[PDB]
Amino acid sequence: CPLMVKVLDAVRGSPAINVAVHVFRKAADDTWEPFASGKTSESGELHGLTTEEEFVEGIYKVEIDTKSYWKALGISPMHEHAEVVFTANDSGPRRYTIAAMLSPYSYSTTAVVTN
Amino acid sequence: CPLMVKVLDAVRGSPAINVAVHVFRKAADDTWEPFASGKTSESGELHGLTTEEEFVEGIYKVEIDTKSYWKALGISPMHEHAEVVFTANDSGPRRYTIAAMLSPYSYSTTAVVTNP
Amino acid sequence: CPLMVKVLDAVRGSPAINVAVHVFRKAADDTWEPFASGKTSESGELHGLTTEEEFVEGIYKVEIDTKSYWKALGISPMHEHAEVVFTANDSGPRRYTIAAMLSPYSYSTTAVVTN
Amino acid sequence: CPLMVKVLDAVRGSPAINVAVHVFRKAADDTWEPFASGKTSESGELHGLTTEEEFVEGIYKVEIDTKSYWKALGISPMHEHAEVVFTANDSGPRRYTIAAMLSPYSYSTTAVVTN
Ligand SMILES: [Zn+2]
Ligand SMILES: [Zn+2]
Ligand SMILES: [Zn+2]
Ligand SMILES: [Zn+2]
Ligand SMILES: [Zn+2]
Ligand SMILES: [Zn+2]
Ligand SMILES: [Zn+2]
Ligand SMILES: [Zn+2]
Ligand SMILES: [Zn+2]
Ligand SMILES: [Zn+2]
Ligand SMILES: [Zn+2]
């Protein structure tokens, strides 16, 4: 995958499973154009979002749906998504794994960018 | 302070000093409208951004400039900003502190929301 | 303060208040000698742990008590403490803030080391 | 795998490759006894550390060597290790993945525990 997204639930110590993810690419105007979407697997991963040729250079936003992920815990999170923006392929071709460790009011997110 | 932003450099273990912070609010033509801005202090803190009156319920984005903050390190970051989005005042008025611990390819943020 | 510890609850979005903190300094024998302790304030902070005189060069462990912090959420955490180890004043005189953002199965810590 | 460790370099945005990891278990005399060790792969991962039968309930410390990992960056880190302590299995046999996103003066760890 040129791009994969990993989501972990830092409250329960588990992959975040069957969580909706939206990817956008910043358009000519300021706007976020829909790029790819899906839901995480049993390992918290979302594979197969894009291909090398559709994954052109640009600014990408990854939005992970969180609003009600937390509901069973009794907590409303800081925002209905966890989002991370990254600038891609601006020096040539690269695989990106976006790793998110999520809590209702905190998250850590790392971009692992390889050959 | 209804809204405070605190920025830490996780690479050198210090406050991120004199860093530009721009706050936006989602405008409902769905664009981000400029809301407040400032530069972090010697303690990495940014106070005085808004007033309990301007600071209504809504969706806010805190954009921390990092385009060149890493330059002396010789690393170009994952993105030219660090952004944190939060929904405010979904249930009455609150003080928000957005704490961002930053690295070039990572970051950890917690929103601390107090009722005072 | 030569040493202060600040604890945030990443689940609830609030300072972690009245939480026990233990500080140790590594002895001659590999043993952790107790150094200072307390409970966090209403701001999640623990001030007044040490004096610049008592804060001699060495390896320090900060242990934040988390075992039952989470009890009301119905979650038992990964460990009964959140712990961070740092090597101190290896160059002169310096003030440390140890900042911990805590969830049951994740934490982020950073050492802010000044002047 | 009962215990897997995955290390990411949060400064460069890559897997931390060929990094030494030592695992310890809290022993009878309150010391840390050596329990397993290895080096991270090209994916930042360390598999094969232990066996279901070796990995009994207890308190485990994962120590990641970071003494010179940062040297080329010109920064000496907060400590010569990144250590994560967890209380294993405390409810029956589980698989553990300890994910550590590392910077010189910070870190985020997450324990993923799966049944
Ligand atoms: Zn894949
Ligand atoms: Zn969605
Ligand atoms: Zn959003
Ligand atoms: Zn800006
Ligand atoms: Zn203020
Ligand atoms: Zn941006
Ligand atoms: Zn303790
Ligand atoms: Zn103090
Ligand atoms: Zn070691
Ligand atoms: Zn394995
Ligand atoms: Zn150590």
Coordinates of all heavy atoms in Angstrom, one line a residue, chain A residues 2-80:
Chain A
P2 N 0.6 2.2 -0.9 CA 1.2 3.5 -0.8 C 0.8 4.2 0.5 O 1.5 5.0 1.0 CB 0.6 4.2 -2.0 CG 0.1 3.2 -2.9 CD -0.3 2.0 -2.1
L3 N -0.4 3.8 1.0 CA -0.9 4.5 2.2 C -1.7 3.5 3.0 O -2.6 2.9 2.5 CB -1.9 5.6 1.8 CG -2.6 6.3 2.9 CD1 -1.6 7.0 3.8 CD2 -3.5 7.4 2.4
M4 N -1.4 3.4 4.3 CA -2.2 2.6 5.2 C -2.3 3.4 6.5 O -1.5 4.2 6.8 CB -1.7 1.1 5.3 CG -0.9 0.7 6.5 SD -1.7 0.4 8.0 CE -0.4 -0.7 8.6
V5 N -3.4 3.1 7.2 CA -3.8 3.8 8.4 C -4.0 2.7 9.5 O -4.6 1.7 9.2 CB -5.0 4.6 8.2 CG1 -5.5 5.2 9.5 CG2 -4.8 5.7 7.2
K6 N -3.3 2.9 10.6 CA -3.4 2.0 11.8 C -4.0 2.8 12.9 O -3.7 4.0 13.1 CB -2.0 1.5 12.2 CG -1.2 0.8 11.1 CD 0.2 0.1 11.6 CE 1.3 1.1 12.0 NZ 2.7 0.5 12.0
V7 N -5.0 2.2 13.6 CA -5.7 2.9 14.7 C -5.7 2.0 15.9 O -6.1 0.9 15.8 CB -7.1 3.4 14.3 CG1 -7.7 4.3 15.4 CG2 -7.0 4.1 13.0
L8 N -5.2 2.5 17.0 CA -5.2 1.8 18.3 C -6.0 2.5 19.3 O -6.0 3.7 19.4 CB -3.8 1.5 18.8 CG -2.8 0.7 18.1 CD1 -3.4 -0.6 17.6 CD2 -2.2 1.4 17.0
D9 N -6.8 1.8 20.1 CA -7.5 2.3 21.2 C -6.7 2.3 22.5 O -6.4 1.2 23.1 CB -8.7 1.4 21.4 CG -9.6 1.7 22.5 OD1 -9.3 2.6 23.4 OD2 -10.7 1.1 22.6
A10 N -6.2 3.4 22.9 CA -5.2 3.6 24.0 C -5.9 3.5 25.4 O -5.3 3.3 26.4 CB -4.5 5.0 23.9
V11 N -7.3 3.5 25.4 CA -8.0 3.3 26.6 C -8.2 1.9 26.9 O -8.0 1.5 28.1 CB -9.4 4.0 26.5 CG1 -10.1 3.9 27.8 CG2 -9.3 5.4 26.1
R12 N -8.5 1.0 26.0 CA -8.7 -0.4 26.2 C -7.6 -1.3 25.9 O -7.6 -2.5 26.1 CB -10.0 -0.8 25.5 CG -11.2 -0.2 26.0 CD -12.5 -0.5 25.3 NE -12.7 0.4 24.2 CZ -13.7 1.2 23.9 NH1 -14.7 1.3 24.8 NH2 -13.7 1.9 22.9
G13 N -6.5 -0.8 25.2 CA -5.4 -1.6 24.8 C -5.7 -2.6 23.7 O -5.4 -3.7 23.8
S14 N -6.3 -2.1 22.6 CA -6.8 -2.9 21.6 C -6.7 -2.2 20.3 O -6.7 -1.0 20.3 CB -8.2 -3.3 21.9 OG -9.1 -2.2 21.6
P15 N -6.6 -2.9 19.2 CA -6.9 -2.3 17.9 C -8.2 -1.7 17.9 O -9.2 -2.2 18.6 CB -6.9 -3.5 16.9 CG -6.9 -4.7 17.6 CD -6.4 -4.4 19.0
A16 N -8.4 -0.6 17.2 CA -9.7 0.1 17.1 C -10.3 -0.5 15.8 O -9.8 -0.3 14.7 CB -9.5 1.6 16.9
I17 N -11.3 -1.3 15.9 CA -11.8 -2.2 14.9 C -13.1 -1.6 14.3 O -14.0 -1.1 15.0 CB -12.1 -3.6 15.5 CG1 -10.9 -4.2 16.1 CG2 -12.7 -4.6 14.5 CD1 -11.1 -5.5 16.9
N18 N -13.2 -1.7 13.0 CA -14.4 -1.3 12.3 C -14.7 0.2 12.6 O -15.9 0.6 12.8 CB -15.5 -2.2 12.8 CG -16.4 -2.6 11.7 OD1 -16.1 -3.5 10.9 ND2 -17.6 -1.9 11.6
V19 N -13.7 1.0 12.6 CA -13.8 2.4 12.7 C -13.7 3.0 11.3 O -12.8 2.7 10.6 CB -12.6 2.9 13.6 CG1 -12.7 4.4 13.6 CG2 -12.9 2.3 15.1
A20 N -14.5 4.0 11.0 CA -14.6 4.6 9.8 C -13.4 5.6 9.6 O -13.1 6.3 10.6 CB -15.9 5.4 9.5
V21 N -12.7 5.6 8.5 CA -11.7 6.5 8.1 C -11.9 7.2 6.8 O -12.3 6.5 5.8 CB -10.3 5.7 8.0 CG1 -9.2 6.6 7.5 CG2 -10.0 5.0 9.4
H22 N -11.7 8.5 6.7 CA -11.8 9.3 5.5 C -10.5 9.9 5.2 O -9.9 10.5 6.0 CB -12.9 10.4 5.6 CG -14.2 9.9 5.9 ND1 -14.7 9.7 7.2 CD2 -15.3 9.6 5.1 CE1 -16.0 9.3 7.1 NE2 -16.3 9.3 5.8
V23 N -10.1 9.8 4.0 CA -8.9 10.5 3.4 C -9.3 11.5 2.4 O -10.2 11.3 1.7 CB -7.8 9.5 2.8 CG1 -6.5 10.2 2.5 CG2 -7.6 8.2 3.7
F24 N -8.7 12.7 2.5 CA -9.0 13.8 1.6 C -7.6 14.3 1.0 O -6.6 14.1 1.6 CB -9.6 15.0 2.3 CG -10.9 14.6 3.1 CD1 -10.9 14.1 4.3 CD2 -12.1 14.8 2.5 CE1 -12.0 13.8 5.0 CE2 -13.3 14.5 3.1 CZ -13.3 14.0 4.4
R25 N -7.7 14.9 -0.2 CA -6.5 15.6 -0.7 C -6.8 17.1 -1.0 O -7.9 17.4 -1.5 CB -6.0 14.9 -2.0 CG -4.8 15.4 -2.6 CD -4.4 14.6 -3.9 NE -5.3 15.0 -5.0 CZ -5.2 16.1 -5.8 NH1 -4.1 16.8 -5.7 NH2 -6.1 16.3 -6.7
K26 N -5.9 18.0 -0.6 CA -6.3 19.4 -0.7 C -6.3 19.8 -2.2 O -5.4 19.5 -3.0 CB -5.2 20.2 0.0 CG -5.4 21.7 0.0 CD -6.5 22.1 1.0 CE -5.9 22.8 2.2 NZ -6.8 23.8 2.8
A27 N -7.4 20.5 -2.5 CA -7.6 20.7 -4.0 C -7.0 22.1 -4.3 O -6.4 22.7 -3.5 CB -9.1 20.7 -4.3
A28 N -7.1 22.4 -5.6 CA -6.8 23.7 -6.2 C -7.3 24.9 -5.3 O -6.6 25.7 -4.8 CB -7.2 23.8 -7.6
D29 N -8.7 24.9 -5.2 CA -9.2 25.8 -4.1 C -8.7 25.3 -2.8 O -8.0 24.3 -2.7 CB -10.8 26.0 -4.2 CG -11.5 24.6 -4.3 OD1 -11.1 23.7 -3.6 OD2 -12.5 24.6 -5.0
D30 N -9.0 26.0 -1.7 CA -8.6 25.5 -0.4 C -9.2 24.2 0.0 O -8.8 23.6 1.0 CB -8.6 26.6 0.6 CG -7.2 27.0 1.2 OD1 -6.7 26.1 1.8 OD2 -6.8 28.1 0.9
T31 N -10.2 23.6 -0.8 CA -11.1 22.6 -0.2 C -10.5 21.2 -0.2 O -9.6 20.8 -1.0 CB -12.4 22.5 -1.0 OG1 -12.1 21.9 -2.3 CG2 -13.1 23.8 -1.1
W32 N -11.1 20.4 0.7 CA -10.7 19.0 0.9 C -11.5 18.1 0.0 O -12.7 18.0 0.1 CB -10.9 18.5 2.3 CG -9.9 19.1 3.3 CD1 -10.2 20.0 4.2 CD2 -8.5 18.9 3.3 NE1 -9.0 20.4 4.9 CE2 -8.0 19.7 4.4 CE3 -7.6 18.1 2.6 CZ2 -6.6 19.7 4.7 CZ3 -6.3 18.1 2.9 CH2 -5.8 18.9 4.0
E33 N -10.9 17.5 -1.0 CA -11.5 16.6 -1.9 C -11.4 15.2 -1.4 O -10.3 14.7 -1.2 CB -10.9 16.7 -3.3 CG -11.4 15.8 -4.3 CD -10.8 16.0 -5.7 OE1 -11.2 17.0 -6.4 OE2 -9.7 15.4 -6.0
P34 N -12.5 14.5 -1.3 CA -12.6 13.1 -1.0 C -11.6 12.2 -1.8 O -11.6 12.4 -3.1 CB -14.0 12.7 -1.3 CG -14.7 13.9 -1.1 CD -13.9 15.0 -1.5
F35 N -10.9 11.4 -1.2 CA -9.8 10.6 -1.8 C -10.0 9.1 -1.7 O -9.9 8.4 -2.7 CB -8.4 11.1 -1.3 CG -7.2 10.4 -2.0 CD1 -6.7 10.8 -3.2 CD2 -6.7 9.3 -1.3 CE1 -5.7 10.2 -3.7 CE2 -5.6 8.6 -1.9 CZ -5.1 9.1 -3.1
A36 N -10.3 8.7 -0.5 CA -10.5 7.3 -0.2 C -11.2 7.2 1.2 O -11.1 8.1 2.0 CB -9.2 6.6 -0.2
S37 N -11.8 6.0 1.5 CA -12.4 5.8 2.8 C -12.6 4.3 3.0 O -12.3 3.5 2.1 CB -13.8 6.5 2.9 OG -14.7 6.0 2.0
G38 N -13.0 4.0 4.2 CA -13.1 2.6 4.6 C -13.3 2.4 6.1 O -13.6 3.5 6.8
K39 N -13.3 1.2 6.6 CA -13.3 0.9 8.0 C -12.2 0.0 8.4 O -11.7 -0.9 7.6 CB -14.6 0.4 8.5 CG -15.9 1.2 8.3 CD -17.0 0.8 9.1 CE -18.1 1.9 9.2 NZ -19.3 1.6 9.9
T40 N -11.6 0.2 9.6 CA -10.5 -0.6 10.0 C -10.8 -2.0 10.2 O -12.0 -2.4 10.7 CB -9.9 0.0 11.3 OG1 -10.9 0.0 12.3 CG2 -9.4 1.5 11.1
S41 N -9.9 -2.8 10.0 CA -9.9 -4.3 10.2 C -9.8 -4.7 11.6 O -9.6 -3.9 12.6 CB -8.8 -4.9 9.3 OG -7.5 -4.8 10.0
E42 N -9.8 -6.0 11.9 CA -9.6 -6.6 13.2 C -8.2 -6.3 13.8 O -8.1 -6.4 15.0 CB -9.8 -8.1 13.1 CG -11.3 -8.5 13.1 CD -11.6 -9.9 13.1 OE1 -11.0 -10.6 12.2 OE2 -12.4 -10.4 13.9
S43 N -7.3 -5.9 13.0 CA -6.0 -5.5 13.5 C -5.9 -3.9 13.6 O -4.8 -3.4 13.9 CB -4.9 -6.0 12.6 OG -5.0 -5.5 11.3
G44 N -7.0 -3.2 13.4 CA -7.0 -1.8 13.4 C -6.4 -1.1 12.2 O -6.2 0.1 12.1
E45 N -6.2 -1.9 11.1 CA -5.6 -1.4 9.9 C -6.5 -1.2 8.8 O -7.5 -1.9 8.7 CB -4.4 -2.3 9.6 CG -3.5 -2.7 10.7 CD -2.3 -3.6 10.4 OE1 -2.1 -4.1 9.3 OE2 -1.4 -3.8 11.3
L46 N -6.2 -0.3 8.0 CA -7.0 0.0 6.7 C -6.1 0.0 5.6 O -5.3 0.9 5.4 CB -7.8 1.3 6.8 CG -8.7 1.7 5.6 CD1 -9.6 0.6 5.2 CD2 -9.6 2.9 6.0
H47 N -6.2 -1.1 4.8 CA -5.3 -1.4 3.7 C -6.1 -1.1 2.4 O -7.3 -1.0 2.5 CB -4.9 -2.9 3.7 CG -4.0 -3.2 4.9 ND1 -2.6 -3.3 4.7 CD2 -4.2 -3.6 6.2 CE1 -2.0 -3.5 5.9 NE2 -3.0 -3.7 6.8
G48 N -5.4 -0.9 1.3 CA -6.0 -0.9 0.0 C -6.7 0.4 -0.3 O -7.6 0.5 -1.1
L49 N -6.2 1.5 0.4 CA -6.9 2.8 0.2 C -6.7 3.4 -1.2 O -7.6 4.0 -1.8 CB -6.5 3.8 1.2 CG -7.2 3.7 2.6 CD1 -6.3 4.4 3.6 CD2 -8.6 4.2 2.6
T50 N -5.5 3.3 -1.7 CA -5.1 3.9 -2.9 C -4.0 3.1 -3.7 O -3.5 2.0 -3.2 CB -4.5 5.3 -2.7 OG1 -4.5 6.1 -4.0 CG2 -3.1 5.3 -2.2
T51 N -3.7 3.5 -4.9 CA -2.7 2.9 -5.8 C -1.6 3.9 -6.0 O -1.9 5.1 -5.9 CB -3.3 2.5 -7.2 OG1 -3.8 3.7 -7.8 CG2 -4.5 1.5 -7.0
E52 N -0.5 3.4 -6.3 CA 0.7 4.3 -6.7 C 0.3 5.5 -7.6 O 0.7 6.6 -7.4 CB 1.8 3.5 -7.3 CG 2.7 2.8 -6.2 CD 3.6 3.8 -5.6 OE1 3.9 4.9 -6.2 OE2 4.0 3.6 -4.4
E53 N -0.5 5.2 -8.6 CA -0.8 6.3 -9.6 C -1.9 7.3 -9.1 O -1.8 8.5 -9.4 CB -1.1 5.8 -11.0 CG -2.3 4.9 -11.2 CD -2.5 4.5 -12.7 OE1 -1.8 5.1 -13.6 OE2 -3.3 3.6 -12.9
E54 N -2.9 6.9 -8.3 CA -3.8 7.8 -7.8 C -3.2 8.6 -6.6 O -3.7 9.7 -6.3 CB -5.2 7.3 -7.4 CG -5.5 5.8 -7.4 CD -6.9 5.4 -6.9 OE1 -7.2 5.7 -5.7 OE2 -7.7 4.9 -7.7
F55 N -2.2 8.1 -6.0 CA -1.6 8.7 -4.8 C -0.6 9.7 -5.2 O 0.6 9.6 -4.9 CB -1.0 7.6 -3.8 CG -0.6 8.2 -2.5 CD1 -1.3 9.2 -1.8 CD2 0.5 7.7 -1.8 CE1 -0.9 9.7 -0.6 CE2 1.0 8.1 -0.6 CZ 0.2 9.2 0.1
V56 N -1.0 10.8 -5.9 CA -0.2 11.8 -6.4 C 0.3 12.8 -5.3 O -0.2 12.6 -4.2 CB -0.9 12.7 -7.5 CG1 -1.7 11.8 -8.4 CG2 -1.8 13.7 -6.8
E57 N 1.2 13.7 -5.7 CA 1.7 14.6 -4.7 C 0.6 15.6 -4.3 O -0.3 15.9 -5.1 CB 2.8 15.4 -5.3 CG 4.0 14.6 -5.6 CD 5.1 15.4 -6.5 OE1 5.2 16.7 -6.2 OE2 5.7 14.8 -7.4
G58 N 0.6 16.0 -3.0 CA -0.4 16.9 -2.5 C -0.4 16.9 -1.0 O 0.5 16.3 -0.4
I59 N -1.4 17.5 -0.4 CA -1.5 17.6 1.1 C -2.7 16.7 1.3 O -3.7 16.9 0.6 CB -1.9 19.0 1.6 CG1 -0.8 20.1 1.3 CG2 -2.1 19.0 3.1 CD1 0.5 19.6 0.9
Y60 N -2.6 15.8 2.3 CA -3.6 14.8 2.6 C -4.1 14.9 4.0 O -3.3 15.2 4.9 CB -3.1 13.3 2.3 CG -2.9 13.0 0.8 CD1 -1.8 13.5 0.1 CD2 -3.9 12.3 0.1 CE1 -1.6 13.2 -1.3 CE2 -3.8 12.0 -1.3 CZ -2.6 12.5 -2.0 OH -2.6 12.2 -3.3
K61 N -5.4 14.8 4.2 CA -5.9 14.7 5.6 C -6.5 13.3 5.8 O -7.4 12.8 5.0 CB -7.0 15.8 5.8 CG -7.7 15.7 7.1 CD -8.6 16.9 7.4 CE -9.7 17.0 6.4 NZ -10.6 18.1 6.7
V62 N -6.2 12.7 6.9 CA -6.8 11.5 7.4 C -7.7 11.8 8.6 O -7.2 12.4 9.6 CB -5.7 10.5 7.8 CG1 -6.4 9.2 8.4 CG2 -4.8 10.1 6.7
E63 N -8.9 11.5 8.4 CA -10.0 11.7 9.5 C -10.4 10.4 10.0 O -11.0 9.6 9.3 CB -11.2 12.4 8.9 CG -11.0 13.9 8.7 CD -12.4 14.6 8.5 OE1 -13.5 14.0 8.4 OE2 -12.2 15.9 8.5
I64 N -10.3 10.1 11.3 CA -10.7 8.9 11.9 C -12.0 9.1 12.7 O -11.9 10.0 13.5 CB -9.6 8.2 12.7 CG1 -8.3 8.0 12.0 CG2 -10.1 7.0 13.4 CD1 -7.1 7.9 12.8
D65 N -13.0 8.4 12.4 CA -14.3 8.7 13.1 C -14.2 8.2 14.5 O -14.0 7.0 14.8 CB -15.4 7.9 12.5 CG -15.7 8.4 11.1 OD1 -15.3 9.5 10.7 OD2 -16.5 7.8 10.5
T66 N -14.4 9.1 15.4 CA -14.3 8.8 16.9 C -15.6 9.1 17.7 O -15.6 8.8 18.8 CB -13.1 9.5 17.6 OG1 -13.3 10.9 17.5 CG2 -11.9 9.1 17.0
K67 N -16.5 9.8 17.2 CA -17.5 10.4 18.0 C -18.1 9.5 19.0 O -18.1 9.8 20.2 CB -18.7 11.0 17.2 CG -19.8 11.5 18.1 CD -20.8 12.3 17.3 CE -21.3 11.5 16.0 NZ -22.7 12.0 15.6
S68 N -18.5 8.3 18.5 CA -19.2 7.4 19.4 C -18.4 6.1 19.7 O -18.9 5.2 20.4 CB -20.5 7.0 18.7 OG -20.3 6.4 17.5
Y69 N -17.2 6.1 19.2 CA -16.3 5.0 19.5 C -16.2 4.7 21.1 O -16.1 3.6 21.5 CB -14.9 5.2 18.9 CG -14.0 4.1 19.1 CD1 -14.2 2.9 18.4 CD2 -13.0 4.1 20.0 CE1 -13.5 1.8 18.6 CE2 -12.3 3.0 20.2 CZ -12.5 1.9 19.5 OH -11.7 0.8 19.8
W70 N -16.4 5.8 21.7 CA -16.1 6.0 23.1 C -17.4 5.8 24.0 O -17.3 5.6 25.2 CB -15.6 7.4 23.3 CG -14.3 7.6 22.6 CD1 -13.9 8.5 21.7 CD2 -13.1 6.7 22.7 NE1 -12.6 8.4 21.3 CE2 -12.1 7.2 21.9 CE3 -12.9 5.6 23.5 CZ2 -10.8 6.6 21.9 CZ3 -11.7 5.0 23.4 CH2 -10.7 5.5 22.6
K71 N -18.5 5.7 23.3 CA -19.9 5.8 23.9 C -20.1 4.9 25.1 O -20.6 5.3 26.1 CB -21.0 5.5 23.0 CG -21.3 6.6 22.0 CD -22.0 7.8 22.7 CE -22.3 8.9 21.7 NZ -23.1 8.5 20.5
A72 N -19.6 3.7 24.9 CA -19.8 2.6 25.9 C -19.0 2.9 27.1 O -19.3 2.3 28.2 CB -19.4 1.3 25.3
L73 N -18.0 3.9 27.0 CA -17.2 4.2 28.2 C -17.9 5.3 28.9 O -17.5 5.6 30.0 CB -15.9 4.8 27.7 CG -14.6 3.9 28.0 CD1 -14.5 3.6 29.4 CD2 -14.7 2.7 27.2
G74 N -18.9 6.0 28.4 CA -19.6 7.1 29.0 C -18.9 8.4 28.7 O -19.1 9.3 29.4
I75 N -18.0 8.5 27.7 CA -17.2 9.7 27.5 C -17.5 10.2 26.1 O -17.4 9.5 25.1 CB -15.7 9.7 27.9 CG1 -15.5 9.4 29.4 CG2 -15.0 11.0 27.6 CD1 -14.3 8.5 29.7
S76 N -17.7 11.5 26.0 CA -17.8 12.2 24.7 C -16.4 12.8 24.4 O -15.9 13.5 25.3 CB -18.8 13.4 24.9 OG -18.8 14.3 23.8
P77 N -15.8 12.5 23.3 CA -14.4 12.9 23.0 C -14.3 14.4 22.7 O -15.3 15.1 22.5 CB -14.0 12.0 21.8 CG -15.3 11.9 21.0 CD -16.4 11.9 22.1
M78 N -13.0 14.8 22.5 CA -12.7 16.2 22.3 C -13.3 16.7 20.9 O -13.5 17.9 20.8 CB -11.2 16.4 22.4 CG -10.3 15.6 21.3 SD -8.5 15.9 21.5 CE -8.4 17.3 20.5
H79 N -13.5 15.8 20.0 CA -13.9 16.1 18.6 C -14.4 14.8 18.0 O -14.0 13.7 18.4 CB -12.7 16.6 17.9 CG -13.0 17.1 16.5 ND1 -14.1 18.0 16.2 CD2 -12.6 16.7 15.3 CE1 -14.2 18.1 14.9 NE2 -13.3 17.3 14.3
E80 N -15.3 14.9 17.0 CA -15.9 13.7 16.4 C -15.0 13.0 15.5 O -15.4 12.0 14.9 CB -17.2 14.0 15.8 CG -17.5 15.4 15.4 CD -17.9 16.3 16.5 OE1 -18.9 16.1 17.2 OE2 -17.1 17.3 16.7

